[PDB]
Design a protein around this ligand. Structure first.
Ligand SMILES: Nc1nc(=O)c2ncn([C@@H]3O[C@@H]4COP(=O)(O)O[C@H]5[C@@H](O)[C@H](n6cnc7c(N)ncnc76)O[C@@H]5COP(=O)(O)O[C@@H]3[C@@H]4O)c2[nH]1
Ligand SMILES: Nc1nc(=O)c2ncn([C@@H]3O[C@@H]4COP(=O)(O)O[C@H]5[C@@H](O)[C@H](n6cnc7c(N)ncnc76)O[C@@H]5COP(=O)(O)O[C@@H]3[C@@H]4O)c2[nH]1
Lengths: 326, 326, 326, 326, 328
């Protein structure tokens, strides 16, 4: 939200207000007409009970398929494999008893046969699907994305490991290896987030002004059974109108390159328009992660930019220098 | 279906078979009863029309939410919003027209009742999804963290280190490794525990694993980072105090990420989800490496489960077993 | 209440005055309408009696579960099991007998079945819960917080042990070890309570002026099976506009660090919006405890501060000096 | 569940089973009696609506108290106060609007009676909670003293000293310990008396306990204090006057805090609450240490209950047993 | 309770069971006669309302006096006086407001005048008093006894100060001045609790077989502005049929001497039956206090004895001797 305006805000409570308005409208419409109050209640109760009897058939149909993986997903317990499909077997049983009592006392098997036939037609023809705007809410409320996992892996593997040790290297470099004639490299490690999934291997391209300057001292650790895992960084110069203007550290994000490469392979099943919404979500998730980390923005900065379609004299140098202003 | 018996198989079509059995039973029961089919046809058409109108009302209520995110999610276009909320404007309109044309088969009273019921369902949250259906749609649409983690792993590590492993092994064996020392074999062995407990070093939890020597590095450039390094390790296997063989051992860092996500509260990632994604990650790697150009001829996958009773389980014996049939 | 304006005051009697106003209004309304005064009394009695016959059903439903932990919670007493669920078994028995007499003489079996259905549906569907502002009163009236235990632990373990002997160390240091060139360290050990639970390890950070000077002679004791438990403190200087202003003894409060760290683990079940309410309650409990302690405020000072979000030129040195003025 | 049989198990689902049995009996009784179901539906709906109106009136009465803490507890917002007192404004509004519409199934007279009865309940204190319901809500929501104490213990002591215990023990054995003296085993032993009577030194309560020597210290910086120190001890176990072995012993200090909280009158802490919290603290530590990375492989828990008849209970045997099956 | 059979046990719930039996009998009797339940309920309501209106008049009469000590007992607040006299002003106000409505709709000023006369006659004549068996109940419930204060004073002033150091004092006396030729002084200080409050000054009297041998090393402390307060004890020996049987550390209980001496002065207002009532409650409270103290029963416990009415050759030497036997 605060990085770039095109980042969507989290979904809120907007359907509920529309539901309230619709409820009030239908209630006043019922009041304006002539019909007994008891008949409306009875019909509403029957409709509600039918909508609940229409889910047990779907649950049994789903169980008829889920029972084949009892030894692979539900250990060996029938209680778990029935709880995974038919909600909770305690509320559901009472609801079933009440529904059958209200449906049997108020041609009885005819309705059962018709409900079964309708449910079978719905499940076979596939009429009961999910809208694209509802999947995007169910898979975002429950964290069912790829960007969430990528952001958490990035944080855990890189930021939780180099950020505390960042100052101890730059401070030593600025005195031992950096000449007093050259300006000292700035703090606040900078990460660039191109909202296009285009991550060049080298930073020299796409901007003829930034040039590779020097190295940084490396650090060593033990991870996942492999020792001497070396982390190294680099420093780039900023040439403004042909003359040096400042120095900093520029970083891309490898997960963006991974998202870009996913859209090309056929086995991935990743569409071209998915790697854009995931790219948008990744930045928000990473910013949220960094907001409350103990190693806060005191050592890092984020830069998000969208490449103009008309090439309105856009240059990375202007953005990075404007960031270096703060 | 070969790495471990506990890995589940993809879902089949048992739901369709259960649906067909239910449809046959309903048709037989209706045939047994005495009634003309015209009434059944009329009632089925009315039920389908009611379901269509309910879906339309639900979509209309949902439309009130995404209209505030139009400038960021769906762009300034007013058509993509309705296309996402509904799915197909033309088909939806045709279906609505067909459904409302059969009103001749107190007319607004039914519409008011349907609206009232739909608003109640929206407000009270009675239209939730069982976990067995959420998992099904997520697996169908590739909405798992494990899928993204596996693809990132394959693109970033295996696709870069697999081709050069043979050359590195041969050069190490010729230049440094002696004839007295057992020659390091090919087919890099990857350890994939289905518990996500990844120790920092292999020396612990197995006294018979000892570090032997390192291996030459490799240099590359990625995401603007100059001179990215990669490293490996060589470990020796001891059998009753005597050496039995030598190979190259590795864990899976994404398993470490999956384990670490479950402890933080901001990740919102549970404990059983850890096991389920752990089991799915190995399946995804097997599927990806099944037809990868750098196929299984260059690396082997080992999946093991720690026994609950701790019946003297040794990883050295496990890896030696796969070493025998190398 | 006197530390910071943000600290809440104890809950009082406002619900009682609102209840009195509602009682008067409803009494006047009843007087203004036309109905026999006997009917009002009879209906009020019947309502009050049904609300008491509807509590034994809940009590028995609870006692169906409380009898499984008899040997582990209630020794072996059937009398003490029914005393934890059903209040007191004498007043309750008399109330039951009177309720039956009143409800039986004023289709009697019909009402019992309806009460049973209503109570069972309340228990199953969960319609009878607690608002967040009634739990917050019932668990604060009876001292059911985390901050209560943490504050009493802090007192008992630290301040009941070091405060009385704080004079005999400062006095010895000031004259044997403190040079006459340096100003004497002031009395009244100062405690900082950040209402953010963000507790840095070293005091040099977060304010570039306070700098570590030296230590104090330590004291020892034997506690809980460990002998020679060591307590030590430290002395900090306050540099004003480049020059020294005074000296004091500075401490954070470690239970705040515990409250912060609890909110990041997943098994804690302790939210990010809770460790601010508890942080504001811990300070109140400490102030109340130290108000009446014999080792009173003549030896310690409390400083509560909330970090501005806009960075309104806040410096801890200014607040510490302001309190040192007195 | 293994530490001692007296430790309770977490609450299950007996209330729901009893509720189902009660609902089934009520439904069967209603079927046995002769009456149309429409009356049952009407009366059930009316009862539920009256309950909802009563809850709303109670919420409005409670709102008269939380509006004088707006600038301290709920921030400058008027919506959080209502959300806390009521719970869900949109759902509450829908439920109220649907509830009052069913009055058509002297109308202000019933509202006056409901208000009068609710005011009587508030004033006279007739809606209190039995202790076995307060206990249930507290244990569900983690509103215990022992929860905070156990998490404080784990974060402040064990998570800091457990990794280095092996190194300290090994250095003590190599540098100082002789071969003639028995080797001190691993696995720091923690005694958890479920009586909160913690003696100052173990030389009392068992003549067979003799202090042998100390262990090398540990040093760190925490909360602005320079060089906090940690220390442990080594004890010798005598069998019939002869040495049998050695171990590293400790009590649990939070038990001492729990005991000392119950003597003061300001704490408001009873003498049965002490035993309940003491038996809950052990359960919480066992849960925490079950899945920690520094698991039970470095420490052991010993819970013992002092016999009432004093049947010659010797703590040395209790320690020696676990030493045997180490 | 377990100290002597004569010590009473705290009151429980017998009035409540009698109340349930009475309630059930009254309910059955009402069911056994012909009368509409409407009358049976409205008469009960009127009875309760009249009782509440009477309580308020009594409270106002009391407030007319309690408002005079306003600057001495209730600081300066007109509201704490009302809180002390008339219970709680909100519940009481609600009960008033509800009581009027039922008693005004169900000759209305006449009944108010009759209630006023009845309440004034009760206050003046004194018909409403308290039986001596419920004053005792409320005093014992709220801890309004002389013996409560005396027992807590005894504990806090003496035992909490000397019990921990008794072991060191005994040990030093044993290795320094005590010879192994004689019996070593046993541990576990013994306290005698005569339930007659007759405490003689010197233990040599009232039993010729108790003779005083030696003192004990002193203990010194500072208390309440007095420098160097000192404590000392004495050691006694028990002679069996002319032969020494053992050695103990004997003591009476001084608060018993205070309870006895308080009953001779006429200004104290302390009777001779009250002395016996309090002497059996001081022991109960002291044992309850010593049961849950860290300086527990391992350092000392009590010995209660009642002098026989017939004087059947009592010998407290036998009692202390048998306690010595049961110690081992
Ligand atoms: N700028 C930069 N410098 C680094 O050294 C570095 N190392 C990792 N990263 C990125 O942070 C995250 C950490 O990945 P993780 O360890 O969880 O899984 C890693 C790991 O399983 C494997 N892998 C990558 N590099 C190595 C390596 N040297 N050794 C072993 N495994 C490796 O491939 C996965 C993804 O790596 P990248 O897809 O290139 O980007 C990573 C990743 O997004 C780095 N980014
Ligand atoms: N600044 C500072 N210096 C101290 O010496 C100190 N000692 C205690 N405290 C804090 O006061 C309270 C009393 O500690 P307690 O013994 O009751 O529980 C302690 C105790 O059970 C255990 N523990 C801590 N330090 C030791 C220690 N050296 N040895 C044994 N156990 C220890 O871990 C619990 C929590 O310790 P902290 O969470 O770091 O904060 C403590 C605590 O809140 C201190 N605070």
């Amino acid at each position: 939200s605060s990085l770039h305006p095109s980042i969507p805000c989290p979904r809120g409570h907007g359907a509920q207000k529309a539901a309230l308005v619709l409820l009030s409208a239908c209630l006043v419409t019922l009041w304006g007409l002539g019909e007994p109050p008891e008949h409306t209640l009875r019909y509403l109760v029957l409709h509600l009970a039918s909508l609940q009897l229409g889910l047990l058939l779907n649950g049994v149909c789903s169980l008829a398929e889920e029972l084949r993986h009892i030894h692979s997903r539900y250990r060996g317990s029938y209680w778990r494999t029935v709880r995974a499909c038919l909600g909770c077997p305690l509320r559901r049983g009472a609801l079933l008893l009440l529904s059958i009592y209200f449906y049997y006392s108020l041609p009885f098997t005819w309705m059962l046969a018709l409900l079964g036939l309708s449910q079978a037609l719905n499940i076979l023809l596939g009429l009961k699907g999910l809208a694209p705007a509802e999947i995007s809410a169910v898979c975002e409320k429950g964290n069912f994305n790829v960007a969430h996992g990528l952001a958490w892996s990035y944080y855990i593997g890189y930021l939780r490991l180099i950020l505390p040790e960042l100052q101890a290297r730059i401070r030593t470099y600025n005195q031992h290896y950096n000449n007093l004639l050259r300006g000292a490299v700035s703090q606040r490690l900078y990460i660039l987030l191109p909202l296009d999934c285009g991550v060049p291997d080298n930073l020299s391209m796409a901007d003829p002004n930034i040039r590779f300057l020097d190295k940084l001292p490396q650090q060593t650790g033990d991870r996942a059974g492999i020792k001497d895992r070396v982390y190294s960084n680099s420093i780039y110069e900023l040439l403004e109108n042909g003359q040096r203007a400042g120095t900093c550290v520029l970083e891309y994000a490898t997960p963006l390159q991974t998202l870009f490469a996913m859209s090309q392979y056929s086995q991935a099943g990743f569409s071209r328009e998915d790697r854009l919404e995931q790219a948008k979500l990744f930045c928000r998730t990473l910013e949220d992660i960094l907001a409350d980390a103990p190693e806060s923005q005191n050592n890092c900065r984020l830069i998000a930019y969208q490449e103009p379609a008309d090439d309105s004299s856009f240059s990375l140098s202007q953005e990075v220098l404007r960031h270096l202003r703060q």
